[PDB]
Design a protein around this ligand. Structure first.
Ligand code: RVW
Ligand code: RVW
Ligand code: CL
Lengths: 302, 302
């Protein structure tokens, strides 16, 4: 019993974290096989971040300018390239701790774990979610850049995120491991703003299902609703619109609990219209949206 | 910027998790040097857990009855003993992945990370706190028993918790790595109840300091208070009494923010008497008490 915001074990990723230093800037990199991946703004000074021409700034750099340190050993850069907003440093040694891995571009609403690093050294791990506006609400300080987000299915690590920037609002923006930013953001120190951050409705419903499984049932009402009717309430409260795909994904949870999906939608509707009246669900006074339906099943079964 | 409930990287502990099987029961063990540590109720059936005589049940067991499997390799038990409520299986091979480690008995109010396992396989990591009533609010399902809680300072892993039981109320109780239970609990399937669970006042104050550091300042009032006066409010709301030691520990945070401790106590007093009025602090509608003063400093500095 009990429900916590659990992150995947981070060991397989700890063994891939390195320190990349270009000039005076040191950030974290990801060493997989014979390639180190890092944010390309490692090649930028302070003046550069205003409006950097990354192509021109890379022309002034050679292999020996990129200092890659794994633990206390130094790595020999035999090649370097730029893929979108990520720099790929080819080293002469394959990482002996490379796990089975793939690069994945996740969708808004999906969850993943973050290993937050500083100078190629792990500091902590936490579970977060890609917000619908393609931002992440994490904990990143200077030097964190190059910190990676990942999932693990069996022995396969799916890297999906690399931290790049902290927006002026305090949220965070990054790329997939191919250097493509999530959202409209660019790796420049300019005026960038996220859109409306909506609540991931399907995740809230999964979390309400977890609550029922764990004993918290007070929110369960005597009513039901329709998908169109519920989506009307969702818009007024800036909730993601619920599709039939979303309903289909919660099937396994609806089966385990004996609670229809539209029945749970009617309980959530009441919670948005009336609030919690000071009560708590799973030790939280807000509706939590950073647990996917797959996360609830995986935690309740493990 | 940003504040998350961060757990220590779990890699050093992942390499120590093994699967112990005695009879039909399989739970997790901790392999350090040439000793495997596991809950002693591994030697118990279902009838036994009612009122087990662990000494008599161990007399019926020999070294070859304890099956210890690390990954896909089997370990040779050359000795076995019982220390309080933990079983120490001496194996013939030292764990090559043993980190620098020590056994620590933490105090109520302290935090630690938990690597939740099942059959010696990691499933997830999360950050929790020893409640003042010596329980922990985690996520443990059958087979989780033997899951360990730890801290990491530099390269030193301080193991402080091993999961043993889930109480009828849904909270969890366990031991230090010397087999001594936290709290009055016993490893029997009997009627055991935790006392009043109070809120860790010093941790809430640390969290309010983190909020200020991150921009959330609305709770900051124009008032102050005294230690005796505040403790009066703490008792009415089942908050831990605040000592001068607690005030001294928050010194570094009071220095960084320029907010006196008794000034922050007066803001918390208002929050307990009036509530949040629907507002949120660091994305939470409740007062969070699972961040120690040392945790806030470590996260804001890392
Ligand atoms: S990580 C991903 O899947 C694994 C199997 O789970 C394969 O071994 C890898 O080659 C692949 O990238
Ligand atoms: S883990 C603890 O401290 C370390 C140093 O940080 C020592 O090396 C260990 O022997 C000790 O148990
Ligand atoms: Cl909350």
């Amino acid at each position: 019993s009990g429900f916590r915001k659990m992150a995947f074990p981070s060991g397989k990723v700890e063994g891939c974290m390195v320190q990349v230093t270009c000039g005076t800037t040191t950030l974290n990199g990801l060493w997989l096989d014979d390639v180190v991946y890092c944010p390309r703004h490692v090649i930028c000074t302070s003046e550069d971040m205003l409006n950097p021409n990354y192509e021109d700034l890379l022309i002034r750099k050679s292999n020996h300018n990129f200092l890659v340190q794994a633990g206390n050993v130094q790595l020999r850069v035999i090649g370097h390239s730029m893929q979108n907003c990520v720099l790929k440093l080819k080293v002469d040694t394959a990482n002996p701790k490379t796990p089975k891995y793939k690069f994945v571009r996740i969708q808004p609403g999906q969850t993943f774990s973050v290993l937050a690093c500083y100078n190629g050294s792990p500091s902590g791990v936490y579970q977060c979610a890609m917000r619908p506006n393609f931002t992440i609400k994490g904990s990143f300080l200077n030097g964190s850049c190059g910190s990676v987000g990942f999932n693990i299915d069996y022995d396969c690590v799916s890297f999906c995120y690399m931290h790049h920037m902290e927006l002026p609002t305090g949220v965070h923006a990054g790329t997939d491991l191919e250097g493509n930013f999530y959202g409209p953001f660019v790796d420049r120190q300019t005026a960038q703003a996220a859109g409306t951050d909506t609540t991931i409705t399907v995740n809230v419903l999964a979390w309400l299902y977890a609550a029922v499984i764990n004993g918290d049932r007070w929110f369960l009402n005597r009513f039901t609703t329709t998908l169109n009717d519920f989506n009307l309430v969702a818009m007024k409260y800036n909730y993601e619109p619920l599709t039939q795909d979303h309903v289909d994904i919660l099937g396994p949870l609806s089966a385990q609990t004996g609670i229809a999906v539209l029945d749970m939608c009617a309980s959530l509707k009441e919670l948005l219209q009336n609030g919690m009246n000071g009560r708590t669900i799973l030790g939280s006074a807000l509706l939590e949206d950073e647990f996917t339906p797959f996360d609830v099943v995986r935690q309740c079964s493990g």
